A paper describes a structure:
The augmin complex, or homologous to augmin subunits (HAUS) complex, is an eight-subunit protein complex required for building robust mitotic spindles in metazoa. Current models suggest that augmin binds to pre-existing microtubules within the spindle and recruits the γ-tubulin ring complex (γ-TuRC) via the neural precursor cell expressed developmentally down-regulated protein 1 (NEDD1)7–10.
Overall, augmin adopts a ~45 nm long, highly flexible structure, containing a V-shaped head and a filamentous tail. The filamentous tail measures ~350 Å and is composed of a neck and two legs (one long and the other short). Interestingly, 3D classification of the head revealed two conformations: one extended (extended state) and the other compact (contracted state). In the contracted state of the head, both branches 1 and 2 (~100 and ~90 Å in length, respectively) are shorter than in the extended state (~160 and ~110 Å, respectively), while the angle between the two branches remains similar in both states. In branch 2, HB4 from H3/5 exhibits a ~20 Å shift towards the kink from the extended to the contracted state, accompanied with rotations in the kink and HB3 of the head. H2/6N/7/8 (consisting of 7, 13, 13, and 3 helices, respectively) run in parallel, with their N-termini located at the tip of branch 1 and C-termini located in branch 2. The neck, composed of H3 and H5, each containing 15 helices apiece, is segmented into three HBs, HB4 (H3-α8–9 and H5-α9–10), HB5 (H3-α7,10 and H5-α8,10), and HB6 (H3-α6,10 and H5-α5,10). The H1/4 dimer holds H3/5’s N and C-termini in both legs together at the bifurcation point, contacting HB9 in the long leg and CC1 in the short leg.
Residue numbers in the entry:
A (entry chain D): 213 to 318
B (entry chain E): 586 to 633
C (entry chain A): 168 to 223
D (entry chain C): 554 to 603
Amino acid sequence: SELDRINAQYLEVKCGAMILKLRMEELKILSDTYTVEKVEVHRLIRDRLEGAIHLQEQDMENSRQVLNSYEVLGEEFDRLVKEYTVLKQATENKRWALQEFSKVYR
Amino acid sequence: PELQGIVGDWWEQPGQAALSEELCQGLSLPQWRLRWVQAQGALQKLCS
Amino acid sequence: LSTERAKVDNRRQNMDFLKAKSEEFRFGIKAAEEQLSARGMDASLSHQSLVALSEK
Amino acid sequence: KTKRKTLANNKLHQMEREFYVYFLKDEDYLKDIVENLETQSKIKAVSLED
């Protein structure tokens, strides 16, 4: 019983040693990964990404607000949107053919 | 495996894969690295 | 009993060396911890956060 | 222990450690360093061409 007790106490003492060695390797790799310059550079990356993305969802929010303001008018204006989209698609189809024929003639 | 990933992160990707050409529009970091490789290869050829 | 006694006596000799190395490695852990805390480490400076921000 | 030794031995990797550092803190510094190294390469090319 004393033999097994000393065996298990040795295992309990030894397991923490390699656990803390694992902790040392993780902490030392984390320390060597980011130096003094790299921490401030990554903070500037956080600032730059925030400054860009605060413009980005602002642009998408403005676009969605414009779409909602068009949707306020009603389904008749939605039919007008579809009709003018079809008319402008046909219009650009004729315009591109005219431009291509003008380029061919030159 | 988490420590293996942490080992990989420092070795090849220290914020390098977090950049594009739209952010910092002038020239992107892979283009700077390619220009550095070309210039340093020219310098190494001239030195040898 | 003699074989197991030799084993546990080797382990009981290893107790003191393991404890001393544990104290040295704990001091190394605290040194690495203060090295990390001097620069102010968090999840924002990691690769994952910047890559996630670039991807969104 | 292999990767730390290769990092210590290779100055190119240690300058890759500061590529994005000088690209994303003060881009003028990285631009000046790149232009200085390019002009050094051109000067060496002119010197060995003569």
